[PDB]
Amino acid sequence: ENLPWVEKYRPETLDEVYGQNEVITTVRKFVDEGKLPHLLFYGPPGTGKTSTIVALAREIYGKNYSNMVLELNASDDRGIDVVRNQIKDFASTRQIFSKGFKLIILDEADAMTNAAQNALRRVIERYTKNTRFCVLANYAHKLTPALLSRCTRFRFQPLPQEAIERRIANVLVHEKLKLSPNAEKALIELSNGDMRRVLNVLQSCKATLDNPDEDEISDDVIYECCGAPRPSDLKAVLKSILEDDWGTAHYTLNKVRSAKGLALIDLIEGIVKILEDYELQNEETRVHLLTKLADIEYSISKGGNDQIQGSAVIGAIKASFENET
Amino acid sequence: SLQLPWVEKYRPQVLSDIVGNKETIDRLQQIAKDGNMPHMIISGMPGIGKTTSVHCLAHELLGRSYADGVLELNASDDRGIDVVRNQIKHFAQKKLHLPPGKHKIVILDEADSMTAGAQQALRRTMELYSNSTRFAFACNQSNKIIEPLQSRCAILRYSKLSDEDVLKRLLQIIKLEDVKYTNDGLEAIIFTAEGDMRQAINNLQSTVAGHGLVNADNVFKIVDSPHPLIVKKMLLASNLEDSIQILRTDLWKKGYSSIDIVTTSFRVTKNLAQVKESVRLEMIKEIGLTHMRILEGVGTYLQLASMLAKIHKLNNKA
Amino acid sequence: LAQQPWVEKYRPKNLDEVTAQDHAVTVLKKTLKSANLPHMLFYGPPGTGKTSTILALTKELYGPDLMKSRILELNASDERGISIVREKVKNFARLTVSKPSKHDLENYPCPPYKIIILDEADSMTADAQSALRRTMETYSGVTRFCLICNYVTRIIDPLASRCSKFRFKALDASNAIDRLRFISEQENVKCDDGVLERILDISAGDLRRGITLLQSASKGAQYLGDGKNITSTQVEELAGVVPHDILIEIVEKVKSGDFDEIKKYVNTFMKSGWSAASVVNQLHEYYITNDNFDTNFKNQISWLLFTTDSRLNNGTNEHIQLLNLLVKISQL
Amino acid sequence: SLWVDKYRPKSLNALSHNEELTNFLKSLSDQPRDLPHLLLYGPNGTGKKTRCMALLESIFGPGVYRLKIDVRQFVTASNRKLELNVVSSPYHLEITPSDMGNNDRIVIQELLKEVAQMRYKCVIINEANSLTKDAQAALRRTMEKYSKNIRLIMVCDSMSPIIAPIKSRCLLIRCPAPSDSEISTILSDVVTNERIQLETKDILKRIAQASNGNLRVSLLMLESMALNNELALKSSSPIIKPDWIIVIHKLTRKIVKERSVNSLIECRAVLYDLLAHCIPANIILKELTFSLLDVETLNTTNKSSIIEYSSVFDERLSLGNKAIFHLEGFIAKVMCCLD
Amino acid sequence: RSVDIPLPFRTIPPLNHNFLPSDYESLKDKNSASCIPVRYQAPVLLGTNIKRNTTLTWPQLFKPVTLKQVLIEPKLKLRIKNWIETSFHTLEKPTEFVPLMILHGNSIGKKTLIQTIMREIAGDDNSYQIYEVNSNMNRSKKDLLDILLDFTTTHSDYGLVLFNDVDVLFKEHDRGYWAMISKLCEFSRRPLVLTCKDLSLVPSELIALASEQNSLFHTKKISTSTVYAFLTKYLKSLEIEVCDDWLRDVVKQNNADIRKCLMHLQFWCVDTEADLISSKNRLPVLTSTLGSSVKDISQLTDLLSINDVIGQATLNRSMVRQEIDSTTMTPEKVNTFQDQNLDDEMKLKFDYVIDYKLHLNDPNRQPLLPFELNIYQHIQEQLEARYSYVREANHRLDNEYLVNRFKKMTESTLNFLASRIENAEIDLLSATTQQIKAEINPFVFEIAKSDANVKFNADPSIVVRKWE
Ligand SMILES: Nc1ncnc2c1ncn2[C@@H]1O[C@H](COP(=O)(O)OP(=O)(O)OP(O)(O)=S)[C@@H](O)[C@H]1O
Ligand SMILES: Nc1ncnc2c1ncn2[C@@H]1O[C@H](COP(=O)(O)OP(=O)(O)OP(O)(O)=S)[C@@H](O)[C@H]1O
Ligand SMILES: Nc1ncnc2c1ncn2[C@@H]1O[C@H](COP(=O)(O)OP(=O)(O)OP(O)(O)=S)[C@@H](O)[C@H]1O
Ligand SMILES: Nc1ncnc2c1ncn2[C@@H]1O[C@H](COP(=O)(O)OP(=O)(O)OP(O)(O)=S)[C@@H](O)[C@H]1O
Ligand SMILES: Nc1ncnc2c1ncn2[C@@H]1O[C@H](COP(=O)(O)OP(=O)(O)O)[C@@H](O)[C@H]1O
Ligand SMILES: [Mg+2]
Ligand SMILES: [Mg+2]
Ligand SMILES: [Mg+2]
């Protein structure tokens, strides 16, 4: 059937989750003992927060997943009643013959309101003995300490390189796709530990591949599909600023941004990442470069004119590096 | 089955067991023994003993009459217009016989979430029927409750628990639970508690069930917050290049958001006793500048990198 | 009544009639005939032909009478993404699609799915992380999101996933003058040499600013009633650009180096009403592009212009900032 | 009322100085149908709002000057009684952004709603520069939506903080300050209507040169001197300045003559009295900076530092809340430099 | 590709985090002297009195037994006493006398004054029967006009109707409330009282009748010295000895409220061996020295100026989303009630309090919650703990000040220019506030000063004092 790869390669079992080893064993410890506290999963998106709880719920409930798991999203239509009424009806109504803990999965609860979070905490407190609550949110600082102190916190760290590489191998040898090692690395660095990014990019690469059975995806296809700046383009701008004339540096700055649709904020972040890998002779060079570029980036967000902001970036890099020379 | 959390297993049932705010608790004990409980609005930070104090006071006052003498309403229950005019008024007007000095208590927990209109309708309910029933309020923000309600109640502002108070109760818990511990392990729990005994118990309980012996290394593995010593090394590194490496690999690559890094950095800077009190204010100022940039929307890696450069410039220039 | 802004009076009516952008039309011709056009994004300089191209595709798809009804262009300005757009889209799409009209038959394909145009949808007070994404899952048979962005700095990868973006290159000099010259000829606008290039130089490649500037200049020429061609000074005035003669005096006072001499000139200049921001922009063009200064001078003056521009943007006294900038440049 | 308000040009023909703009505004009144959104900018006291009022009068009639005052009270999230005087008329409505603080975005979006809900109504926005970037974007929302029924006229002394989208869709009109000869001509007509006895015509010229192009200041200076001297101005009549300018002038001398700690404490008390008299902080900083630069005992290096620290603290003043910290900080740095 | 930046590549050393338990001891919270308890003396109590061992609260234990004990000015006490006495004698005479008194103002005993007067009018507790209508019930025309008419139509007896908290009205729950009052104004032979805190909520019609009949009394707030004196007499009755510094402190924070203080005194005057509330902060080793060097001050003044910029930004940018109250009137709720299709069952679901000010809330800029990170306060508290004048500047010129000053200041200007030999009211307000603040008003003082110097225009002394 026609289905996205995100909805196709979801972990049905807890063994299919990669990159979250510490969370998986502790979660797998809770089921085997039988003691399961209220769960609070948070971290960067696409790290497998929903996949982990669904796999655990399927592992425990077996075929009773449909009648014992109720999934809620705070972002859709959910009033102060609709938040609680479906929860309170599911908690109050019991199957009698099924005395196991009923699980309620709350997705994107960071967008929930202050009083609703406090109301949810009292709802959780009321049904501790017969109901278990799982809360998912993107950011921990958006959650009140009243709700934080009730549910155990499990931070989902971004997926490492090894976790992405293993799942990449599964996709290629199953969907009949070939990935060059250079393109694989470029996708990994750009992914930033987000398998939702990885699966969607690979899906689009196959769609744009007119001959998927024989064409090998390279660096240019990945960068153009995702709209990310290539390292060569960033390196070309950096070397033009460092060792060329002011007029030529301005020419290369405007040409690269116009020919690739690259904003100055992305240019500054990429330059900082590239310059991080070089041993600057003087310590004050790094201090001035980081301080000046941060002020430029802050002023860009306020809505300044492009030409002056672009020249400030060239001046900051040129003046910082002359100090070490 | 399940294991009873030490938050609930060691909940104080008597007003004497509550530690912290010794002045306010002592007067509350006298009120329970004597009677004539005044209207109070207990305010303070979460998890310092606000709800527990009201429940203990109600239990010690009514005793056997607690089942039908207390109308407890929280955020989960409805506290709208109709409830105030009908349910609360009926409870206040109910003729309940109690020993002299005892009075019915209407516990409106989490009153900060109550609407202003409901509070206004509650003004004359507490004033007219104060002879037979009394009102107790617990909230996190005292300014959320309207002023005319505050003019009819004795406002009690619960404060942050001191390190001695939190440590004393933790000592009783580990002694009653036979918990192996060390001096550095308890210091980490007090550090992560921040005057929150509810968070101190949760960290202590998770350490025991997680890694057994309560070490500082074991504690900091479960709080899943940025490690204070990792942040301190980043903020006090002799080389800027080394500090940049610490931030990228141990904080940015591990998924810690810019808010948590700034919050941990400000927390560590506040307790940096090695540095002078003048430089400490400057380093806090740079963190304050960086925190402002994140709030506007600029919370990228460069802002945190510039914060380290400015802080390291302060140390080198000193 | 008869007046209509020239920015929309010369919008393309056919997809192939758009100026340049051969990359955009070639993929769009293939996509239009298959009738399955997915949700897509366009990125380019503000006013480079994003809203014009998508409407030209829209016009060739449905009927002009039916286009205004089937394609309800919900604006990020008029409606909020999760408040009003969210409420309207679920009402609009659940509302049964009106039957195709007759003039659609065998002339206009009319693929039944509704295109929901949102130009600069990220410009609102709230970000629809999945609310806009969810209605594509439920209403895939009708709802399409032909959104518009500006740069590669995307808001979210989810929702913005199965999208084939088109790199809307800014209009080159040759074609943009030709479109500018064509509009002037239709409206019999009298303009001497250099005006058409001057309008683009002020607009910096932008056409939306360029066509509106000509319309303001054309009205200004008619306002005088002298029957004379539009002058470059008139184009400079309506755009707030400081004249070159005033700027030349500014760069000569700082060359003298006298603090009092600069102070007196700024006092007279601030009474003229010319903005300091235009001076800083023009000082940036004069100093950076010039070959009479070393790298050290241009490196330091780049920060001085940037610092003055940042302060002049947050509502600061222009007399203090302009005097401070000119004095600091003098010490360089 | 005052001579500034009673000797007010109430028609396009009544305008005297800057004839080229007067012809431009007259040509705009020829076709009110296609009246674009206007952004009039220039120095203070140049007649920007007078020309806007005259332009609106030529479009509708004398009824535009029939102004009624409606007080609107609003409550924010922390219960501050925000009251705003919304000047209105049967043809146009006037608002002042710098009266609602940072809460201007909600009140601007609210106030424009009923005006659109109720052939077009012109809305005059005084000091449009003081609007935050959130409200300026919100203003751009209304221009692209309610252009059929709402025409926006923006008056601001500085156009630089205005965002680019507003500029690209608003007809930019510049109002240069009148010359000293033009101010004297206006004062000459003003003097004749009040029968003020002038010993020589140089008295009016000295008033014009002391106003720095501000017609309201020159009109107010002429009225104060004439009333003080029984409507008989002489060549030896001193030019009357407001007391706060004199106080600032005394403040500048104290900074230069005494560089110590107790002097700054006295300067802070002087600043408190000036702020208690409802004087805007930016005007205090601007006058204090230029008066300090006028001292002849300071060398070039000191003067460059005064304007540098003033520029730094002026940005801090616009981005701050309490002006006592920024104003004292500027003085403390100046005393730190002059030593 | 072929692009090689002319800088050597870096070989990042491995970073190892092996922390000794000794390093974990440095995590101990350093002693902060900024927080400063004062620990007032425990309340020395003596004797055994019945006034102390009571089942009633202290504010109602000291319920006034006569007119003298109420803390409302005796000037207005006599006027209200006269009207009620004349009302009962007038409404016993067949009848221009509208029984409506409005007792607005920020006073405290606006309800006990009516009760204490009514006790003296009859002299017997059973003789007077005051029907009090409070906000705890539904004060609608459908739910109260039936009961109130039978109470005020039939026929010693001394009956009065009290409408407390008349400014707190809900849109649906109190439907037809003002129409019911107008109905009661005509068909009733018993006096009516409506107390309030703001007169704007009362319709302008009912203000006119009260003003014409001299039944519109404004009870302003009383001085804190009188409240302080009254508390001393009260505490003497129970034989309570209290340090005068704390008793002065209690009156200040409670804004000279007799009910709030008596509630405050009741909790803190129990017989326990514990110190009192700190309240007022002692000096936390406060040394606001000159600092000798202006350079040291130039750093502190810059730090203060920067911190104000931080405080302006961060304070109204909260990460956790806070809701708007469902009872405050809002622009979205105003139009929601304008639809005729809204039935009764949902109008009650979202009912708002009737107000004269629209509550405008920004869903993106909201005040910070207490648990959120706030670095502005920590810098402010630390700076205020070592420099005294910083704390003075914290409450020197707030937003309420310099606005009522400007309003009063312009009124003197609008009265001076209108006294020459309507136009001035609108033409000044047409001028921008900044021009009024710095150009017009400073120059009007110059004109007014020259008027009294020779001793043309009139009334020059008013402007001079306003511009002291
Ligand atoms: N650790 C992982 N192991 C295997 N697949 C993963 C992992 N993390 C994410 N994915 C995949 O990436 C996608 C993310 O699905 P989700 O479970 O919704 O992730 P998520 O972390 O819950 O993101 P959100 O913000 O909650 S929607 C799915 O296709 C998963 O199969
Ligand atoms: N001072 C204290 N002494 C003893 N136990 C305490 C103390 N403070 C908190 N606790 C414990 O920590 C938990 C706090 O519970 P509550 O008092 O209900 O929290 P809270 O102070 O009301 O804050 P909330 O509920 O978030 S508004 C309980 O399990 C108590 O046993
Ligand atoms: N490529 C183009 N071909 C033809 N006319 C163009 C082109 N680009 C711009 N124009 C003209 O300029 C106007 C603006 O073009 P668009 O870019 O489609 O409008 P826009 O996208 O709404 O501008 P922005 O991005 O919202 S500021 C059009 O109506 C045309 O008159
Ligand atoms: N001498 C006194 N005079 C008046 N009231 C007193 C006195 N001593 C104590 N009180 C108390 O002060 C309170 C004032 O009366 P209230 O009815 O509570 O206030 P109010 O008249 O309703 O007006 P408010 O509080 O502004 S809504 C009552 O609770 C009295 O018991
Ligand atoms: N052309 C003119 N002839 C005579 N007086 C003028 C002219 N233009 C402006 N004025 C004077 O300026 C005053 C109004 O200034 P105003 O427009 O409020 O200043 P701004 O333009 O800074 O808002 C009027 O009192 C009027 O006397
Ligand atoms: Mg999910
Ligand atoms: Mg509580
Ligand atoms: Mg567009």
Author numbering:
A (entry chain C): 11 to 335
B (entry chain B): 6 to 323
C (entry chain D): 22 to 353
D (entry chain E): 2 to 119, 134 to 354
E (entry chain A): 184 to 278, 329 to 388, 398 to 663, 699 to 732, 769 to 781
Give passages from the manuscript:
The three alternative RFC-like complexes are formed by replacement of the large subunit, Rfc1 of RFC, with Rad24, Ctf18, or Elg1 (16). Specifically, Elg1 contains two external loops that block opening of the Elg1-RFC complex for DNA binding, and an “Elg1 plug” domain that fills the central DNA binding chamber, thereby reinforcing the exclusive PCNA unloading activity of Elg1-RFC. In all three Elg1-RFC structures, we found five bound nucleotides: four ATPγS in Rfc2, Rfc3, Rfc4, and Elg1, and one ADP in Rfc5 (top right).
By leveraging state-of-the-art cryo–electron microscopy (cryo-EM), we find that the architecture of Elg1-RFC is specifically suited to the unloading of PCNA. Because clamp unloading starts with PCNA encircling dsDNA, we propose that the three structures that we have determined represent (i) Elg1-RFC alone before it encounters a PCNA, (ii) Elg1-RFC that has taken the PCNA off DNA with the clamp being incompletely closed (i.e., cracked PCNA), and (iii) Elg1-RFC bound to the closed PCNA after PCNA is taken off DNA (Elg1-RFC–closed PCNA), respectively. The shared Elg1-RFC among the three structures is highly similar with a root mean square deviation between main chain Cα atoms in the range of 0.5 to 0.6 Å. The Rfc1 collar domain contains five α helices, but two of the five α helices in the Elg1 collar domain have descended to form the Elg1 plug, with only three α helices remaining at the top collar tier. The Elg1 plug interacts with and is extensively stabilized by all Elg1-RFC subunits except for Rfc2.
